[PDB]
């Protein structure tokens, strides 16, 4: 806190309490004791155990039976009005879809749909993997999982 | 048959107004003027004014006639006491408290 770095009144003499500055953090408009600097709260996990997490939670997902796999989940037009009609006969409400190649159409049709996110197959994640009701997968994209967990 | 009448932000104290407004509790308004017209404090003109305005508002708006009224409730508050600065010696100063009172007068027959 800027400004006055002078003694506001002297030490002895005047019977008020002893004080050093208006910047003293027990006053109005002073500083504070221990406010932070900018920081980074991100820790470090290890690679073996981070892959062990995805080794474990998918096992528990199948044991919960919250996993569907299809040959190719696709709608062949960049238009949400058919994705939100295919899913209502797929009997789903909030699912993740993963795909092998970087498809444009499924991503575009699911971007507006706030529940139904479509990730890729590489950049999957534990928290949005666990945070849904059902998860569907792709006959090609699951083989990258097969290779990268083993 | 209650009738309020009030008077707010007046130059009186908070402990001189009661010294005249402890005379008008339970009297016919005839006597409540025959006392207020000759008690000789400052607030004896203010409480006289507000009692007159009360008696008139009962004359107007709630059916009441002048000599019917009996002063049931009267009590005075501590208003917004604004303040000044007057010098005492050696540079010392003072928030001198110019007090004031929210005078209320409630008249009725019941």
């Amino acid at each position: 806190v800027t400004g006055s770095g002078k003694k506001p009144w002297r030490q002895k003499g005047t019977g008020r309490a002893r004080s050093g500055s208006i910047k003293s953090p027990i006053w109005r408009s002073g500083g504070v004791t221990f406010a932070a600097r900018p920081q980074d709260h991100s820790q470090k996990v290890n690679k073996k155990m981070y892959r062990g997490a995805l080794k474990s939670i998918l096992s528990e997902l199948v044991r919960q039976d919250r996993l569907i796999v299809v040959e190719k989940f696709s709608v062949e037009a960049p238009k949400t009005k058919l994705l939100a009609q295919k899913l209502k006969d797929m009997a789903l409400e909030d699912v993740l879809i993963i795909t092998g190649e970087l498809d444009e159409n499924l991503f575009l049709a699911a971007r507006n749909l706030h529940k139904v996110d479509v990730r890729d197959a590489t950049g999957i994640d534990p928290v949005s993997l666990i945070a849904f009701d059902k998860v569907v997968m792709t006959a090609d994209a699951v083989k990258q999982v097969e290779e990268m967990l083993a | 048959m209650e009738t309020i009448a009030k008077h707010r932000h007046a130059r009186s104290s908070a402990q001189k107004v009661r010294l005249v407004a402890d005379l008008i509790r339970g009297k016919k308004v005839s006597q409540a003027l025959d006392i207020l017209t000759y008690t000789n404090k400052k607030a004896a003109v203010l409480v006289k004014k507000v009692l007159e305005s009360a008696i008139a508002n009962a004359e107007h708006n709630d059916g009441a006639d002048i000599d019917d009224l009996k002063v049931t409730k009267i009590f005075v508050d501590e208003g917004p006491s604004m303040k000044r600065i007057m010098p005492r010696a050696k540079g010392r100063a003072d928030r001198i408290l110019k007090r004031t009172s929210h005078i209320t007068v409630v008249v009725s027959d019941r």
Binding site: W9, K12, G13, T14, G15 | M82, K83, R84, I85, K90, G91, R92, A93, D94, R95
Partner: peptide, 22 residues
């Protein structure tokens, strides 16, 4: 209207060297 709130006179340390105890 309104008004201020004065304070903090040069209070002369409230004493001389009065209590000459020696």
């Amino acid at each position: 209207a309104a008004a201020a709130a004065a304070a903090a006179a040069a209070a002369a340390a409230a004493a001389a060297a009065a209590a000459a105890a020696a």
